[PDB]
Amino acid sequence: PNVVVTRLTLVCESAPGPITMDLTGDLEALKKETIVLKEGSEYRVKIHFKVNRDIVSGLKYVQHTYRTGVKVDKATFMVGSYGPRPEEYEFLTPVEEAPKGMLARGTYHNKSFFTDDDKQDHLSWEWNLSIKKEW
């Protein structure tokens, strides 16, 4: 395909190691993968993607976050226009603060969509974020 989503990374300097998932692999297995942030960490979501053949416009990243007892949190980010090249591009969301406090720890269930104004399903995937007192 012209657009290929390759990877999700949580960018956080204070993390003791990389926080990343390979989106070219088994998507069913991503749900079991442990993605941990220390509570209160400042981080950004980084989506890596390739544009292979043709200039594209209106790319968008959508993330739905499910947390027990809370209404689903829906966020849309404009990614924009990109031309073809061999090297992947990286899109980063604005910085956000991870949840903090005893009642905010544990599991956040995410469904992510990389799409565009034409509603193409470039990739849809699930992943879980675990918020912990320590790394």
Curated annotation (Swiss-Prot):
<feature type="modified residue" description="N6-acetyllysine">
    <location>
        <position position="38"/>
    </location>
</feature>
<keyword id="KW-0597">Phosphoprotein</keyword>
<comment type="subunit">
    <text>Interacts with RHOA. Interacts with RAC1. Interacts with RAC2. Interacts with CDC42.</text>
</comment>
<feature type="modified residue" description="N6-acetyllysine">
    <location>
        <position position="111"/>
    </location>
</feature>
<keyword id="KW-0343">GTPase activation</keyword>
<dbReference type="GO" id="GO:0005856">
    <property type="term" value="C:cytoskeleton"/>
</dbReference>
<dbReference type="GO" id="GO:0003924">
    <property type="term" value="F:GTPase activity"/>
</dbReference>
<dbReference type="GO" id="GO:0005737">
    <property type="term" value="C:cytoplasm"/>
</dbReference>
<dbReference type="GO" id="GO:0035023">
    <property type="term" value="P:regulation of Rho protein signal transduction"/>
</dbReference>
<dbReference type="GO" id="GO:0031267">
    <property type="term" value="F:small GTPase binding"/>
</dbReference>
<dbReference type="GO" id="GO:0071461">
    <property type="term" value="P:cellular response to redox state"/>
</dbReference>
<protein>
    <recommendedName>
        <fullName>Rho GDP-dissociation inhibitor 2</fullName>
    </recommendedName>
</protein>
<comment type="similarity">
    <text>Belongs to the Rho GDI family.</text>
</comment>
<dbReference type="GO" id="GO:0005096">
    <property type="term" value="F:GTPase activator activity"/>
</dbReference>
<feature type="modified residue" description="Phosphoserine">
    <location>
        <position position="81"/>
    </location>
</feature>
<dbReference type="GO" id="GO:0005829">
    <property type="term" value="C:cytosol"/>
</dbReference>
<dbReference type="GO" id="GO:0005094">
    <property type="term" value="F:Rho GDP-dissociation inhibitor activity"/>
</dbReference>
<dbReference type="GO" id="GO:1901164">
    <property type="term" value="P:negative regulation of trophoblast cell migration"/>
</dbReference>
<dbReference type="GO" id="GO:0031410">
    <property type="term" value="C:cytoplasmic vesicle"/>
</dbReference>
<feature type="modified residue" description="N6-acetyllysine">
    <location>
        <position position="60"/>
    </location>
</feature>
<dbReference type="GO" id="GO:0070062">
    <property type="term" value="C:extracellular exosome"/>
</dbReference>
<keyword id="KW-0007">Acetylation</keyword>
<keyword id="KW-0963">Cytoplasm</keyword>
<dbReference type="GO" id="GO:0016020">
    <property type="term" value="C:membrane"/>
</dbReference>
<dbReference type="GO" id="GO:0007266">
    <property type="term" value="P:Rho protein signal transduction"/>
</dbReference>
<comment type="function">
    <text>Regulates the GDP/GTP exchange reaction of the Rho proteins by inhibiting the dissociation of GDP from them, and the subsequent binding of GTP to them. Regulates reorganization of the actin cytoskeleton mediated by Rho family members.</text>
</comment>
